[PDB]
Structure formats: structure tokens, C-alpha cells
């Protein structure tokens, strides 16, 4: 059967708390979001047909030829981490897919998977990424999706073997995947080269992204000048791609800056589709976006109205309304935008237990001084809270700038961002200043990631990095030179198939093998946890995390025909070893399950008891307060010789050594009231 | 005395809840806002020197001649109702005035007084608005203050005597008030004519505002054409003012629309300093502000970063950072902006008992549909929850456009927005659709304010209002045409002064006389409360609303030399009549005070007791169950005759007639247990 | 009136005083994965002696100085707090 595992899970959730940690103490709202009405006929024709009947170059040419603007929706990947800790299930997701696939045909592409997507899909949420992605392609055979990838490290935080990344990309493309993004935390050209090589090997639309940092309109800003970016862009275009892109992880683009940048790019490449990605944090994102989109841009990322603002992308509504009496002519019925926003607003309160609003009330400025990535801040606050330093979270970001100067002005998105975050964590944890930390950085132990970065497991930064600190930290450590990926010894995964199989594998797929190759520890942990309690993501989100409330009936599905009707009566109490019995209702049956409570620890220690099997052992005849001791440990004792006096209230008994010899040790402190029959001392 | 009154207030707060209504049940964080450091020197000279040295026309010319632009802070007026219910005390407010006076001298002006500032200062806050203003100028002798005033109603919601408005303006100008904004929700010209006449009577800078509603770039929008607004502005400037503003509560300024408007108006008036103000609700406001501030704007309204965006005005940080290398040349040290914003962020958590983040999560689209004004939405939700309709508060707004249609496309800011909201409230609580509500508008009792408006007390709209509905509602009520402000008989404020004095006044002031003149009821309530618990507005905000916690000491300053210490001991229990005894540490002594509890309801019921002196009254001899009643009320009874039978456990008792006489009432009734000495029968 | 029902609660967790260089305090809180050195053993300088684990980050303890350790307080597989006396270097 299968019901027993999930029933046990429900009972455990009732007895214990939610398995996943709770950042902020709250409860899900008692409101179900309203699903907008959907038609019946097949979804309209989008762009999957166009790329189907053409090549990536032909499709890109057709897109470029279009007069107007095409929009990117990141509400399925980026808004997650921007507004939450990316905890959204898939069960809630598979409720608007028919609507958008029918309603939205003009939309360019949708981003669902991303970097920090699988590291939670099994670690905190317990699901399979390939499974859910498989369940969406049939729902939307209309609009291409888009993968976010890093250059060297495929999904992980350290550069993976080149063959591994290649075969991973090949499998991902074989999954029916359409559009791919190539990116690197640094400007390490071999990293992007390897990424695009893997993308071309997979075969399909290839887009690379350039990070942005600092100012290009500021003459004082000189480390990353315009001509620096020009060289980067020209090198990448000589490498040859399909579509270019620009990243604004912090939302630092002023309108003048990006419009002059676009003028420069579109000047020398007046054929290439141009795409932008930004995070609206400073609050001026929409203005610059629209300005330097009217300038020369072609594609724009945008988040849903309810999932907008703060740090996420700007909204549907503002862009649609502004681009109305313009030649760009977005031309999208905003009523469907309205109902989409209403559904999302309804859905937000479900995960309201954790949110940036409780900490971050309104969009804060000074991000220029902080340069904290938008997709990182919520997870940073959560990890600080789980660390216990969530109280002094403001001081944490205060120390972040000093760590930036420790590593110098560098571009940080996924890996180095959290590297600086962890270094600042150490900084604030030790409560030490910047200068002397620079001074006595030799003996001071540093987190493993800092050592990895200093060794060079990622690549060379554009501007290099200080030597003396690296010598002070690495000291005697071997240091990686050249490309880490090429220097990395390629390894086979075929043996891992059989290892997984004969350990616990009887249906393991190559996707699962690759997942184990990525994160074997948490992979096996998720596998065993799922095997214990059966499959999840078949129930309501509040039902998943909060569980059913007492004395109510609810329904749960298993497949198309397997849908149940479940009610709960009450719970027993701790019977004899911290165990509970709870009583569920089937469609017509009554069930009783046992749950082992975890809140019963009951740690109690006692003075050693004298065991009667050992004749040498001496026990306390009467409980009471010890008056005096006549024999010290390791001293000779005569037969029937007084050694202790006991007196509780009325009776006084003097304990004598019943056998001749010497003692080993006395368990008496001369000043404790000790109960009878206790191992006061022993006789050889 | 004052100490006893405040101690009594604290005890009452401990026993009961907060006196003011609580929308959302929460508590402020136990953290104090960080006050940034201030220098020691006197504040510099900004524009107050110009105003005291030049005239309003000379000052306006000097402002206009400035190269660049000037900036507005609205955190002290507009942000209040934007994100709160304007419940901010002056206690926290008076802690940054020294900072800004020494730091910020480039601000064109500061807005502190507002339309919804006096009412809250009476009803839900117990302070004196004149008093609070009478310390603010003492802290800021550097920046002119600004105030938004309505024509027909000075601060109220109905027409007021012209004498009252003239006297109010004169008093305010005498107070030292600097900048005056004249505006009316309707474009009823005589209203603004009277307002500007009053402003000129006061003597000083006169500024007028024009609401922007609808689309000017839309050819379909015809009800208020560009030439409609052009004629409005033409006749305004024909009246003769100093500065013009464009009001946008809904925040619906397209960049193209506002830039073409500014260009068109500037061409015909290349002398007028331009003021602009809007509410960033849709999220695209800042784009339009940058565009048509580059075009021709001179003065720009901005809200602080911590209370920025969402539904409020845009932020300091975005404008300062974006316009750095620009001939507009903001020229503001952004370093102090950061601490200014962080103080507000810290203070925001203090008022966590009610905030839009509970309900309105992110800035929503569809504002073009509901067209609800910005700063009033929070109060709408609060009042709906007060009615209990805040549960289904969504249904309230979805019915608002229907009420607008009933009244036709009209301009609504303060009064008529309220009228449409009340109409929607009545509709939704009655469950009335469009055709259903309009079908029977005769028998249905419409709210009072609806009749007030349908009369035409405010004035005739631009295009009139439907006649069939007005006939079906007003029936045969008196109908007033023309300007009711002139039609209103002038009223004498002199005798009312003596009335309020010999009622409860002893040394009242003309400010208080006026305050009672507009609002006498709440003025009386405020005076009664102040005489009850003494002078308030010296408490910490959390102390004011929560009160002292037990086993905690703190310091409260009453006067400059009158500062003392308070600590809490404990609380007693209900002694006999819902009274509690609470003990306080003095600076070195102890005090005890009694508080009458309110949650103690005591009642008496059930059968009464037979009175001994009344021999005719017959009482139950034993406690037991009524079995049978021998005699029915109204029948003759003989001496020594059975009356009733009582049986409890084995005791059978038959009640004999004490006398010979007819029975009048059967107090014993039937089949209800009665104990001994209870009136069963009465004999006269 | 002094209550006799205090019942003070114990916590163990020895504290490494920073002024005592010999004492070693945990830079991070959390559970210990492995310890490379037994008590009373000779260790190098800048050498791996203990491994400390957190939720998603890892730090390896560095030898404070060149000497022989004296006592190991934490043995294996318990969660520690910030600056916990675990080892002493001599
Ligand atoms: C922990 O569950 C994984 C999310 C935290 C790491 C992610 S990875 C991509 C972002 N960049 C960063 O530094 N943290 C985020
Ligand atoms: C009731 O407490 C008074 C607050 C509501 C009135 C204010 S006045 C100005 C705004 N316009 C409106 O209709 N309500 C707001």
C-alpha cells in the first residue's frame, strides 16, 4: 500500500512541528486564490512552432524582425528568491498553466528553473525537478521556457568536470528544453566559452549574459570602464552566439547609463536581439528600463504585479500602461493581467509565514554602497536567523562592504556573493574590526569557501586579487593555476549507476544519477526520506506545511482516479514511551496510527546504585544527609570498622566496612543527602 | 495636579486595553529608532531669509530664477495617511527637526499641516494641533512650512461661512504659517475663487492646485480634454497666483502625457514656477516625474525613502542618485539621506499595530479601473473593518466604479471620494447591483451624505448630474442653487466663545475657539479627556499605546525642570466591584491607585423573593419541584385550602391558603424549580 | 521575600577564555564532524586539528600555535555554541 506512509506523515506533523524550519512564526491564511476561467480549445500558436519549423538562428531572426517589444516573465524563477526563500511547491504551480498557455501567446518566454532551484527542491522541499518540469511541458506546448545556467559550475558552487557539464546540458536539452542562458560569476572567458560550447553541443538557442556593476557614466568609476565592457562584448560576439543579454543583479542602471550603453552596442551590432535583466530594488528600475528600451532594446524581463517591487522585477501593469500610445505597442489585454495578479496576491498569503516584509518593510536605498544581489538578500536573512544572528542582521550587512574591500571591487552573483556573505558572517560573529582582521589574517581560521576561492577553484578575476592576504590564508596550501575545469580530473559516472542501484536503487534514472553526482549527500537523504513517507506534492500547501486541523474532512488525490476523503478526530496522549495514537477517517473507514513523539528526552542522572551481585560494593542502608566520612579513597579498612555516619531525621546508622581490605574510591562529597542502597564506596 | 492624572491614566491602560481603536492586534518591537548626530551651531539660512527679506512675488521670482530644481518633503503630511492612519504623535516627530534644520537647507519647503491632520488630532489622537505647530516653527526657523487647504470647507467636509475661512486664514498667517495650497476636489470655480481670495486676505504666498484625472493623451478621453484643462489653467492664471500645481491622487501620470502637458503649458507661461505632486501607486510614477521634470518642472514633491513608493510618493534616494551628473543638479549630500531614512525605518515598526502591509502587500495595478484616491485607501480599509466589512473589503472596492458610474465620471479627492465610498458601502452591505440599485432609488433609504451631495451643497459639477436619480432620491427636499457658501448666513463667533468658556472654558484661546467652531463635539470631548487625565503628548509612543510593563523603570519628563521616574510593581485583582489596585515606584517612594474595571458585568434574574411584611404574599416553604397548582389566577381561595404541591426527594408538601381571598397572579408559574421563600401566590 | 524555589539550571559548555591563548574556542556554533587529534598529542602550527559543521558552510580549525595539546573537551557529534572551550594548546 501507500496510504500508511502519508497517514504516518500527517500524524507526525500533528504531533511534531513542520519538518522544514520556520523563519518567522505565523500561520497560512484561510483563503484559496481564485483561479481565472480558461477556454477549452487547444492553446494558440506562440513561438515553439516558430523554433520548431526553423533553426535557432531563423527563430532569432524572426524575433528581431518583429516590430515592437517582447516580454520575459521571471515570476516562476526570480520572484521566488526575490520575495521568498524559493519555497513554492509545484502543486500550487500546476493551477494556472492552462490559463497562461491559452491566454498568453504573445509572451516571449518563461523562466522556471534556475540556479538555486534544485538545492532546495530536495533539501528543504522534497520533490524531483525533472518530474515537475516534465509535468509542465504538456501543460504549455505553446511558449518556450528558459534555463538559467552558470558557466563552469553547472548547478553547484564549484567548477564541475567538463564532461559532467556537457552531458548534463545534453540531458537537459533532451528533456524538451528550449532556451538556455550562459553566465559566469566572474568574467572568466574560458568559463563562458565552456558554457556556450556545452549549449551548442546540446543544440538550441544559446544566450550569454554579462554582469553589470558600478557606473559607466561616472568618469571616476574606472575599474569597469565602457571600453572594458566593449571588449567583453566584442570577444563574446566573436565567439558567436544567438542572443546577447545584460544582468543587473542589484538594480543599478540609471536611464542615461543604459541608454548610452545600448547606443554603443546597437551601433556596432544592429542585427542582434538585445535582452535585459534587472532587479527593481532602488525603485528607479522601471524608468531606466523603459527609457533604454525605447532606445534600442528588444526583450525585457518583468514580474507579475503582486510579485513585483521591493527587489523583484517591475510589474506587468506599469510596462503595459506606459507602452500604450507608443510605436513599441506591447498590445496585451490587461484584464488577464489583472486576474493573474489577483491569483498571485491570493497565493502569496499561503507562504506568509516567511517573507521579507516582516524585516524589509519598504524598498531601501544605499544598495550602491551595499551592492547586495537581489536574489540573495532574503536567503541571507533566513540563514542569519537560523545561525542565531538574525537579531544583529543590520550589522551583518554593515560588515559586508569591508569584506568587499577585502576581496576588492569584484562582480559577485551566485558563488562570490555568498562567499562575501560568509566572510562577513565570520566577521560579525567574532565582532572584530577590518584593519586588524587584515593584520592577523595568518593564524585566523577561515571558512572553507574562502579558502576555495583564494586557491582559485573558480578562475582568475578580471582585476586580479591581493597577494599578501592569499599568502596569509593559503600559506602552505596547494594552489590551483590555470583553468580549474581543465585541471580537474574527468571522472566516470557509470559506476555511480550501479552503486546507487545496489545500495537503494531499483528504478533510478540517469537524471537521478546526475542529481547524485551533483549533491550526493542531500540526494540520498531526500531519497530515503521520500521512501519513508511516500510521495509528496499531492496535497494542499497549507495541508503540507500546517497539516489538517482537528475535526474536519478534506480530500487528497493520488492520481487521476485515486482521490480520497479524509477526516481526523483527535489525538491520544503519551502512553508509555512518548508515543501518540491518532484516529483518521477514510471515505467510510476509521484508522488508528502510532506516532513516536520526539519531545520526550527526559535526561536524568543519579548517584551510582550499589549492585548486590558485587559483594565488595557497599550500599547506603538509610537515606539521609551524610554527616562525616571516616575513610578516604584508596585507604585500608578493617572489618566492621566505622567509615560513614548517616542521619536523616530520627535514626542514625554508622556504615562499617563489612570485609577486611582497602577501598578503591568513595562517591561521597560529605555534604549531600543520599538515598539508601547507593554505591557510596567499594571494597576490593 | 498632573502626576496623579497620568498615573491614573497608566493604571487604566494597564487594566483595560488601549483607548484608541486597534485595527490589527500586534505590538511594536522593543527597539528605539537611531537618532543621527547633530552639530551645535545655529541652523543656516535657506529661503525663510528670502521671505522675510522679500515679498511673495519677489520670493517666487527668486525661486524661478534658480538654475536647477527644488525638492519637497511630504513625510510629515502625506505619507501619514498614505501608509498609516495619520496617527503619528509629535513626540517622536520632534526628534529630527534639529537634525534637518542643520543638515537640510536646500528644501524648497516642508509640509506639516494638512486637511486630515486636525480631525485626527482631536478624535483618535488627544493633542492640540495649534500647540504642536507652536513648537515646530521654533525648531525650524530655516524652511517655510506648507499647508493644503480646501475652499468651501476650510478643514471640514461641508460648506463653511466665508467669514470663518477668512478668519482661519488670518489666524494661520499670524501663526507664522508660510506656504498655502488652495485646491478643491471639484473644479467649481467660485470655490477656488473664494479660496484664493482668502489666501490674499491672509497675505503671503498663494499656491493653487489642479487635479489631473483621466488620460490627456487619449483621444477617446473627451470629458476633460487638454483644452478643458488649458482653459482651467488660463482662468486660474487670469485670477493671478504665485505657483500652480497638478494634483494626482491616483498617480496616473504617463510620462508622455505629463511631458506634453508641461511643454504645452510652459510655452504660454515662461515665467511661472512649476510645482508637481503625485502618489506612486501604479509604480511607474518616477519615470513620468523624471521625464516631465526634465521638460519644464521646477518644484517636485517627494516622500522619504522608508515611506516611499508602494502607495506613497517616490523616494529621496532614487531622485538624488539618478540626477547626479545632470544639469538639473540636485546637489544634495546623500549621506545624510541614509540616516534620515533609517530613523524613519526604525520608527515605522513602532506603529506596527496598523499598516498597509497586512492587507495591501505590493503596489497593485488596476488603479485605472477603481480610480480610488491614494491617501484615503488605508482609512477606507480601517473603516470597513470597523463596520466589520473589512473581511469582505475586496467587495467594497469592486463596487466603487459602479458608484462612480451612478455619479458619472467625476473628480473626487476629499469629500466626493468619501461620498462614493459611503455609497459603495451601502450598496455592498445591501447586496445591490447596478440596475437593481438604480431601479428602486425612491423607497430605499440612502445615506445622509449622499443626500447632502445630491442636494448640491458642495456645488454643481463640471457636467452636472443625472436628473431621474436626483428626483427619485431627493423627492421634494429643499434645493439650493448657486454657491451655497454665499447662501450660508454669516455666523458670529463671539457669543460662542462665552458659551464654551462658561461651559468648560477658563482661559481659552481663539485657536481653540476656531477649533470648536469647525468641530465643537470632538473639541468638547478632547477638552474633557484632557481635564480628566491631564496634559498628554509627553509619553513614548510604545509607552503611550502599550503602557509601562511590570518590573520596569523609565523616565517621563513633564516640564523642563519637571522630570521624574516611574516603575511598575504589580496588579491586584477584582476586589468587590471590578476595581484593581496597582502600585508604582516614585523616584524614591511608592504610590497606590484604584482603577474601575469594565469587563465586570453583574446581573440579577429568576424568580424574586416573597416579602415577609406582606402577609398576602405567599412564599415557597421548601425548595423543590412544582408538581400541580390547585388554584388558577383569578379564582376565589378559601382559608386552609390547598394551593400547590412540592416534592423533591421524599418530602411532599401542600401549600395551604394563609387567608380567604381570590388569587390575583400565579407567580409560581409551572414546571420550574423553586427554592424556599419564593413568592408563589399573591393575595390582595 | 527570598524564594527558596530557585532551581538553577546547568548548561556545561566550557568557555575558552580569549586571553588564554592555549584555550581554543569555536569560531562558529554547530555540530563537530571529526577531530584529527587526541588529547595530549603534538601538533604543528597552521595544521588541521578539528572540523566544525554548519547548515551550509564549513570551517576547518587552524592550529593556534606549535605545541602539544592537553585536553579535548568535545569528543564527537554534539552541537556547540560560539567560542566553546573544546581544546587547549600547550
Ligand atoms: C540555500 O538553500 C541555497 C540558496 C542560497 C544560495 C543561493 S545561490 C544563488 C544565490 N546567490 C547566493 O549567494 N545565494 C543564493
Ligand atoms: C475620520 O476619522 C477622518 C479621516 C477620514 C477623512 C480624510 S480627509 C481627507 C481624506 N479624504 C477622505 O475622504 N478621507 C480622508
Curated annotation (Swiss-Prot), chains A, B:
* Residues with N6-carboxylysine modification: 247
- Broadest EC class assigned to this enzyme: ligase
Query: Which GO terms fall under biological process for this protein?
Result: gluconeogenesis; lipid metabolic process; NADH metabolic process; NADP metabolic process; negative regulation of gene expression; positive regulation by host of viral process; pyruvate metabolic process; viral release from host cell
Q: Which residues carry this modification: N6-biotinyllysine?
A: 650
Q: Which reaction does it catalyse?
A: hydrogencarbonate + pyruvate + ATP = oxaloacetate + ADP + phosphate + H(+)
Q: How is it modified after translation?
A: Acetylation of Lys-254 might play a role in catalytic activity regulation.
Listed under GO cellular component are: cytoplasm; cytosol; mitochondrial matrix; mitochondrion
Ordered alphabetically, the record's keywords are: Acetylation, ATP-binding, Biotin, Disease variant, Gluconeogenesis, Ligase, Lipid biosynthesis, Lipid metabolism, Manganese, Metal-binding, Mitochondrion, Multifunctional enzyme, Nucleotide-binding, Phosphoprotein, Pyruvate, Transit peptide
Tell me the impact of changing residue 89 to L. In PC deficiency
- The entry's substrate-binding residues are 77-81, 150, 414
All copies of the Biotinyl-binding domain together span 615-684
Q: Which residues carry this modification: Phosphothreonine?
A: 509
Highest taxon of source: Eukaryota
An example Gene Ontology molecular-function term: identical protein binding
Illness association: Pyruvate carboxylase deficiency: Leads to lactic acidosis, intellectual disability and death. It occurs in three forms: mild or type A, severe neonatal or type B, and a very mild lacticacidemia.
What is its biological role?
Pyruvate carboxylase catalyzes a 2-step reaction, involving the ATP-dependent carboxylation of the covalently attached biotin in the first step and the transfer of the carboxyl group to pyruvate in the second. Catalyzes in a tissue specific manner, the initial reactions of glucose (liver, kidney) and lipid (adipose tissue, liver, brain) synthesis from pyruvate.
What is the name listed in the Swiss-Prot or TrEMBL entry for this protein? Pyruvate carboxylase, mitochondrial
Organism name: Homo sapiens
Say which residues of the entire protein are included here.
495 to 1178 of 1178
Swiss-Prot record, chain C:
Q: Where in the cell is it found?
A: Mitochondrion matrix
Top-level taxon: Eukaryota
- On this chain, the residues bearing N6-acetyllysine are 2, 36
Transmembrane regions listed in the UniProt entry: none
Residues annotated as carrying N6-biotinyllysine in the record are 56
Q: Where is the Biotinyl-binding domain?
A: 21-90
Disease annotated for this entry: Pyruvate carboxylase deficiency: Leads to lactic acidosis, intellectual disability and death. It occurs in three forms: mild or type A, severe neonatal or type B, and a very mild lacticacidemia.
UniProt function note: Pyruvate carboxylase catalyzes a 2-step reaction, involving the ATP-dependent carboxylation of the covalently attached biotin in the first step and the transfer of the carboxyl group to pyruvate in the second. Catalyzes in a tissue specific manner, the initial reactions of glucose (liver, kidney) and lipid (adipose tissue, liver, brain) synthesis from pyruvate.
> How is the quaternary structure described?
Homotetramer. Interacts (via the biotin carboxylation domain) with SIRT4.
- Provide the protein name: Pyruvate carboxylase, mitochondrial
Identify the species of origin: Homo sapiens (Human)
**Per UniProt, what is the name of the gene that codes for the protein in this document?**
PC
Whole sequence portion shown? 1089 to 1178 of 1178
Amino acid at each position: 500500500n501507500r496510504a500508511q506512509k502519508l497517514l504516518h506523515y500527517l500524524g507526525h506533523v500533528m504531533v511534531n512541528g513542520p519538518t522544514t524550519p520556520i523563519p518567522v512564526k505565523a500561520s497560512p491564511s484561510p483563503t484559496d486564490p481564485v483561479v481565472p476561467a480558461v477556454p477549452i480549445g487547444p492553446p494558440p500558436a506562440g513561438f515553439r512552432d516558430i523554433l520548431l519549423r526553423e533553426g535557432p538562428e531563423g527563430f532569432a531572426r524572426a524575433v528581431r524582425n518583429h516590430p515592437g517589444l517582447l516580454l520575459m516573465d521571471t515570476t516562476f524563477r526570480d520572484a521566488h528568491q526575490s520575495l521568498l526563500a524559493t519555497r513554492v511547491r509545484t502543486h500550487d504551480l500546476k493551477k494556472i498553466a492552462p490559463y497562461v498557455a491559452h491566454n498568453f501567446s504573445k509572451l516571449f518566454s518563461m523562466e522556471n528553473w534556475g540556479g538555486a532551484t534544485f538545492d532546495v527542491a530536495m533539501r528543504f522541499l522534497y520533490e524531483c525537478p525533472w518530474r515537475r518540469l516534465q509535468e509542465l511541458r504538456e501543460l504549455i506546448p505553446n511558449i518556450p521556457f528558459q534555463m538559467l545556467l552558470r558557466g563552469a559550475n553547472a548547478v553547484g558552487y564549484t567548477n564541475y568536470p567538463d564532461n559532467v557539464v556537457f552531458k548534463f546540458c545534453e540531458v537537459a536539452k533532451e528533456n524538451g528544453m528550449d532556451v538556455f542562458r550562459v553566465f559566469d560569476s566572474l568574467n572568466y572567458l574560458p568559463n563562458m566559452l565552456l558554457g556556450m560550447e556545452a549549449a551548442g553541443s546540446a543544440g538550441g538557442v544559446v544566450e550569454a549574459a554579462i554582469s553589470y556593476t558600478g557606473d559607466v557614466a561616472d568618469p571616476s568609476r574606472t575599474k569597469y570602464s565602457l571600453q572594458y565592457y566593449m571588449g567583453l562584448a566584442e570577444e563574446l560576439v566573436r565567439a558567436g552566439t544567438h542572443i546577447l543579454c545584460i544582468k543587473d543583479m542589484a538594480g543599478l542602471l540609471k536611464p542615461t547609463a543604459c541608454t548610452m550603453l545600448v547606443s554603443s552596442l546597437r551601433d556596432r551590432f544592429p542585427d542582434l536581439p538585445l535582452h535585459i535583466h534587472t532587479h527593481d530594488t532602488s525603485g528607479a528600475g522601471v524608468a531606466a528600463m523603459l527609457a533604454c528600451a525605447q532606445a534600442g532594446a528588444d526583450v525585457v524581463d518583468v514580474a507579475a504585479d503582486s510579485m513585483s517591487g521591493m527587489t523583484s522585477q517591475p510589474s506587468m501593469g506599469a510596462l503595459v500602461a506606459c507602452t500604450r500610445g507608443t510605436p513599441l505597442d506591447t498590445e496585451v489585454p490587461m484584464e488577464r493581467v489583472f486576474d493573474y495578479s489577483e491569483y498571485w496576491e491570493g497565493a502569496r498569503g499561503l507562504y506568509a509565514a516567511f517573507d521579507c516584509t516582516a524585516t524589509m518593510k519598504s524598498g531601501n536605498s544605499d544598495v550602491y554602497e551595499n551592492e547586495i544581489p537581489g536574489g540573495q538578500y532574503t536567503n541571507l536573512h533566513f540563514q542569519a536567523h537560523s545561525m542565531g544572528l538574525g537579531s544583529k542582521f543590520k550589522e551583518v550587512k554593515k560588515a559586508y562592504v569591508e569584506a568587499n574591500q577585502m576581496l576588492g571591487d569584484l562582480i559577485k552573483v551566485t558563488p562570490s556573493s555568498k562567499i562575501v556573505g560568509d566572510l562577513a558572517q565570520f566577521m560579525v560573529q567574532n565582532g572584530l574590526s577590518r584593519a586588524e582582521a587584515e593584520a592577523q589574517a595568518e593564524e585566523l581560521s577561515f571558512p572553507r569557501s574562502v579558502v576555495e576561492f583564494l586557491q582559485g577553484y573558480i578562475g582568475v578575476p578580471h582585476g586580479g586579487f591581493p597577494e599578501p592576504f592569499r599568502s596569509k590564508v593559503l600559506k602552505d596550501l596547494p594552489r590551483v593555476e590555470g583553468r580549474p575545469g581543465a585541471s580537474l580530473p574527468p571522472l566516470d559516472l557509470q559506476a555511480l549507476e550501479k552503486e546507487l542501484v545496489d545500495r537503494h536503487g531499483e528504478e533510478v534514472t540517469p537524471e537521478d544519477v546526475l542529481s547524485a553526482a551533483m549533491y550526493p549527500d542531500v540526494f540520498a537523504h531526500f531519497k530515503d526520506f521520500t521512501a519513508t513517507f511516500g510521495p509528496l506534492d499531492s496535497l494542499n500547501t497549507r495541508l503540507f506545511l500546517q497539516g489538517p486541523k482537528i475535526a474536519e474532512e478534506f480530500e487528497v488525490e493520488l492520481e487521476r482516479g485515486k482521490t480520497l476523503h479524509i477526516k481526523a478526530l483527535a489525538v491520544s496522549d503519551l502512553n508509555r514511551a512518548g508515543q501518540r495514537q491518532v484516529f483518521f477517517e477514510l471515505n467510510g473507514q476509521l484508522r488508528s496510527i502510532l506516532v513516536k513523539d520526539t519531545q520526550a528526552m527526559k535526561e536524568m542522572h543519579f548517584h551510582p546504585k550499589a549492585l548486590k551481585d558485587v559483594k565488595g560494593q557497599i550500599g547506603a542502608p538509610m537515606p539521609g544527609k551524610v554527616i562525616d566520612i571516616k575513610v578516604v579513597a584508596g585507604a585500608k579498612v578493617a572489618k566492621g570498622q566505622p567509615l560513614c555516619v548517616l542521619s536523616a531525621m530520627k535514626m542514625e546508622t554508622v556504615v562499617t566496612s563489612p570485609m577486611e581490605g582497602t577501598v578503591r574510591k568513595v562517591h561521597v562529597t560529605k555534604d549531600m543527602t543520599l538515598e539508601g542502597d547507593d554505591l557510596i564506596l567499594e571494597i576490593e
